[PDB]
Design a protein around this ligand. Structure first.
Ligand SMILES: [Zn+2]
Lengths: 138, 98, 58, 49
């Protein structure tokens, strides 16, 4: 049966019409297009930070966004330079020429509620429960 | 616009005319050479068995070509299907043989 | 050698012919898509991602 | 034993595809089984002059 990719909740003579031989070279190169369209096929990369996890916490990195997006833009330009053979990238995403000071991406400084996730949400909820508790006497 | 509809249950496979009609693998036909070149594989598994035995007759217009001569003794048997099968096979979208 | 008439694929086994005609929906006593050109002999098929052992497949 | 859940067996006048689904669920209903075929996508690709 078909396996599961993710983890789960657990006389007749041969007719003379053909005899194959290689004759026609592919003029743009069929495998050379095949590798490039394999590379172009690649699906959409996940961006899941800033979203609630299983327990209720964000899945980010405790960075505010004005440094976070500049960081990931510089890292994208660095990966672009690694993808190219050259050392300094021609196309760049950081320090392009226009300013980007009113900018903010998604990451895990802020929760959904709007406050700072310097403490976990599960910690805050368990804290609010444990603030009021009653114990029977002796 | 030239498509090949296969035959079923013994009925004849047919071909698309430029008048939009459909016709079996019979009768005198006229091709531009470029059509044969663009589908030079897929026609070979469709036509050659009808060329060798049936009376399907094709005239392929191309204007100019280099040519090859082969001679024979008329006192004996002769057959050209090896040379013609070689030629019809070796037609390439890029090139043609003589 | 073998070949089917509904395509121009070159086949070898009679069980391979019986397997191939089921793609067109025939019957006699696997992949995700199967293409075939009309000038070259380079047919291309495609297979799912998790399955290993790619043998000229996308 | 619940007579009200087996409508087809206990009503001689019940239509076969009758359900009373929002009120009470039945058992022993009229299920319709299939047998399809999903082929892979094929294409014969011709050039053009
Ligand atoms: Zn076929």
């Amino acid at each position: 049966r078909i396996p599961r990719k993710t983890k789960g909740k657990s006389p007749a003579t041969a007719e003379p019409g053909t005899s194959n031989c290689e004759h026609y070279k592919a003029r743009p190169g069929i495998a050379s297009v095949q590798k490039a369209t394999e590379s172009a096929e690649l699906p959409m990369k996940n961006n899941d930070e800033g979203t609630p996890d299983k327990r209720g916490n964000t899945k980010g990195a405790l960075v505010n966004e004005h440094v976070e997006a500049r960081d990931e833009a510089d890292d994208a330009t660095k990966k672009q330079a690694k993808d190219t053979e050259k050392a300094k990238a021609q196309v760049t995403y950081s320090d392009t020429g226009i300013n980007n000071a009113n900018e903010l991406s998604r990451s895990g400084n802020v929760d959904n509620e709007g406050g700072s996730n310097q403490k976990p949400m599960s910690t805050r909820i368990a804290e609010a429960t444990s603030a009021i508790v009653s114990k029977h006497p002796a | 616009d030239c498509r090949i509809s296969f035959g079923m249950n013994g009925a004849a496979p047919m071909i698309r005319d430029e008048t939009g009609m459909m016709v079996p693998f019979e009768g005198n036909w006229i091709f531009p050479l470029a059509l044969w070149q663009m589908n030079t594989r897929y026609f070979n598994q469709q036509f050659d068995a009808w060329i060798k035995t049936g009376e399907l007759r094709i005239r392929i217009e191309m204007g100019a070509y280099p040519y090859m001569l082969h001679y024979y003794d008329p006192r004996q048997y002769a057959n050209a299907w090896n040379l013609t099968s070689a030629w019809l096979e070796e037609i390439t979208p890029t090139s043609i043989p003589s | 050698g073998y070949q089917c008439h509904v395509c121009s694929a070159v086949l070898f086994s009679p069980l391979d012919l019986d397997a191939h005609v089921a793609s067109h929906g025939l019957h006699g006593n696997r992949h995700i898509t199967e293409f075939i050109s009309s000038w070259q002999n380079h047919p291309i098929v495609q297979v799912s991602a998790d399955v290993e052992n790619r043998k000229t497949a996308q | 034993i619940p007579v009200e859940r087996y409508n087809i067996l206990t009503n001689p006048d019940a239509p076969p595809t009758q359900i009373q689904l929002p009120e009470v669920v039945d058992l022993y209903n009229v299920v319709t089984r299939y047998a399809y075929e999903t082929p892979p996508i094929t294409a014969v690709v011709m050039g053009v002059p």
